[PDB]
Design a protein around this ligand. Structure first.
Ligand SMILES: [Cu+2]
Ligand SMILES: [Cu+2]
Length: 128
């Protein structure tokens, strides 16, 4: 089955999609993140961050607090299942993670932790 998805975050603080499904027969899964737009990372940075739905709010609150110099993630946040870097316009980054980190089921959320961006740039990910 397919084992990767392309995710775009724009200067309008949107993701191209709000739903990912990871096929159970995938051993690894790749998210390829792009940033169309003109604005740099410090002003309009986007990342793609994965956790359980329950952990989403701590990860976003703790990450905002941590500042640009930590790419808005709390250092050593063991609630983060996988994530890309924080990127600015014209950049791209991919993350490939072990699908065995994902459960039956649960209910993951992917989101951007740049301050305020999770209000639109969020979605559900499910193992299926
Ligand atoms: Cu396959
Ligand atoms: Cu963002």
């Amino acid at each position: 089955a397919e084992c990767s998805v392309d995710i775009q975050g724009n200067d309008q603080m949107q993701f191209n999609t709000n739903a990912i499904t990871v096929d159970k027969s995938c051993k690894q899964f790749t998210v390829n993140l792009s940033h169309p737009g003109n604005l740099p990372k410090n002003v309009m940075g986007h990342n793609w961050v994965l956790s359980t739905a329950a952990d989403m709010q701590g990860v976003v609150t703790d990450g905002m607090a941590s500042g640009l110099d930590k790419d808005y993630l709390k250092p050593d946040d063991s609630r983060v299942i996988a994530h890309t870097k924080l990127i600015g316009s014209g950049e791209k980054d991919s993350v490939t993670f072990d699908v065995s980190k994902l459960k039956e089921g649960e209910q993951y959320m992917f989101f951007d932790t740049f301050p305020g961006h999770s209000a639109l740039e969020k979605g559900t990910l499910t193992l299926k």
